[PDB]
Amino acid sequence: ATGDERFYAEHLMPTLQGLLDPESAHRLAVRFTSLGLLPRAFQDSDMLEVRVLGHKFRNPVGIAAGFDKHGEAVDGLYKMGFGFVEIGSVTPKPQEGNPRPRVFRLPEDQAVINRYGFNSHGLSVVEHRLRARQQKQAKLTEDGLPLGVNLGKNKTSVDAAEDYAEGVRVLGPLADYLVVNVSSPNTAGLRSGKAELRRLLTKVLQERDGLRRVHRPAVLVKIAPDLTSQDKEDIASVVKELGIDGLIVTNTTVSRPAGLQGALRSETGGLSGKPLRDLSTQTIREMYALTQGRVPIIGVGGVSSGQDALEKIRAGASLVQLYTALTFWGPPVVGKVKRELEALLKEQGFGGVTDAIGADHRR
Ligand SMILES: CCn1c(CO)nn(-c2cc(O[C@@H](C)C(F)(F)F)c(C(=O)Nc3c(F)cccc3Cl)cc2F)c1=O
Ligand SMILES: Cc1cc2nc3c(=O)[nH]c(=O)nc-3n(C[C@H](O)[C@H](O)[C@H](O)COP(=O)(O)O)c2cc1C
Ligand SMILES: O=C(O)c1cc(=O)[nH]c(=O)[nH]1
């Protein structure tokens, strides 16, 4: 462990989180990151490179959606050491989200509960923000640092599929991949038969296919950790039938695992961090098997170490993301996870990340 890792985790982060409300802490982090005011970041080795979704990824550790909802801090996030950045969720029209407070810390559980409710600057604002750096991003992507854009829907929209279609049209041309986020716990009706998922995704794929080739992103579906076995079967079937490019597994949980200690455990919202970790890993495992290992998965939920990352990779993830760990460990967590993952890959006889993807299924 580095000097910075210990100082951030043992002293700086607990101190700052003790002085700030949770949403203020989030907002300041976005500001600092946007300005590049960051501790020095670990040099990515060849072992960490992954080729998937039509792109090179210099390392397999990404920032999950929700940290940079409005695409304000993309360059700072690459500076932090992330191999890829996902922004959003972005809704078609601007919207405020839920009333404050809407983010809650559970430090005794290394967890967070949020009910932001898709607060979003909206597609137009985000479009113009990404256009301002569109060629810089093209070079970053060529250098193995791709960009994902996560699409949401407005609270009052009467046609969910049209909201996602609008997102594809507006931000698709600026993204390496898009995410159809049908799994927020904090918008009424979002997570809801099989035929309607098929309908929605058919429309999204048609819109994507209508973009010019150099502006044509991969399309992924991000799913909840709270799905029934039937839901998971159905999703796998639809994904294969339509040629969806990948899955993001998982969003936050509306469950409250036995054992949570935080005083705020019974707040409404999605739970993230350590209590979500294994529920998410197991969802990756099931989705990989249901798709015969032929559908790339981005694994997310409770990653704070190289071991956590490798467990998701071995379960079937090609790439991982984190968010909640950053709230407790700060920016040095990114180098920590990468260093630990490289060490474990070597210790377990893997030539690189690619060799470990889905390795548990071959035992
Ligand atoms: C879930 C909302 N949330 C929270 C509170 O739960 N904290 N938090 C968060 C909070 C963060 O720091 C808060 C305390 C801040 F900015 F005031 F220092 C950070 C973070 O990485 N900060 C940071 C940075 F951007 C750049 C340099 C140095 C630091 Cl310490 C990253 C985070 F993700 C965050 O996003
Ligand atoms: C405060 C907060 C906001 C989030 N916002 C979004 C979002 O807008 N869209 C989305 O798909 N996921 C969102 N997520 C979920 C994360 O992307 C991720 O799936 C989940 O938090 C699990 O990862 P973690 O345990 O590493 O945080 C959010 C999570 C948190 C904590
Ligand atoms: O904006 C939110 O409330 C939100 C969206 C989402 O997809 N996941 C989450 O945990 N929160």
UniProtKB/Swiss-Prot annotation:
Keywords: Disease variant, Flavoprotein, FMN, Membrane, Mitochondrion, Mitochondrion inner membrane, Oxidoreductase, Pyrimidine biosynthesis, Transit peptide, Transmembrane, Transmembrane helix. Disulfide bonds: none annotated. Belongs to the dihydroorotate dehydrogenase family. Type 2 subfamily. GO terms for molecular function: dihydroorotase activity; dihydroorotate dehydrogenase (quinone) activity; dihydroorotate dehydrogenase activity. The uncleaved transit peptide is required for mitochondrial targeting and proper membrane integration. Its EC number is 1.3.5.2. PROSITE patterns: DHODEHASE_1, DHODEHASE_2. Binds 1 FMN per subunit. This is Dihydroorotate dehydrogenase (quinone), mitochondrial. The lineage of its organism: Eukaryota, Metazoa, Chordata, Craniata, Vertebrata. The identification of DHODH defects as the cause of postaxial acrofacial dysostosis (POADS) was obtained via exome sequencing, demonstrating that this method is a powerful tool for identifying genes underlying rare Mendelian disorders. Exome sequencing consists of targeted resequencing of all protein-coding subsequences, which requires around 5% as much sequencing as a whole human genome. The active site is at S184 (nucleophile). SUPFAM superfamilies: FMN-linked oxidoreductases (SSF51395). FMN binds at A65, G66, F67, D68, K69, S89, N150, N181, K222, T250, G273, G302, Y323, T324.
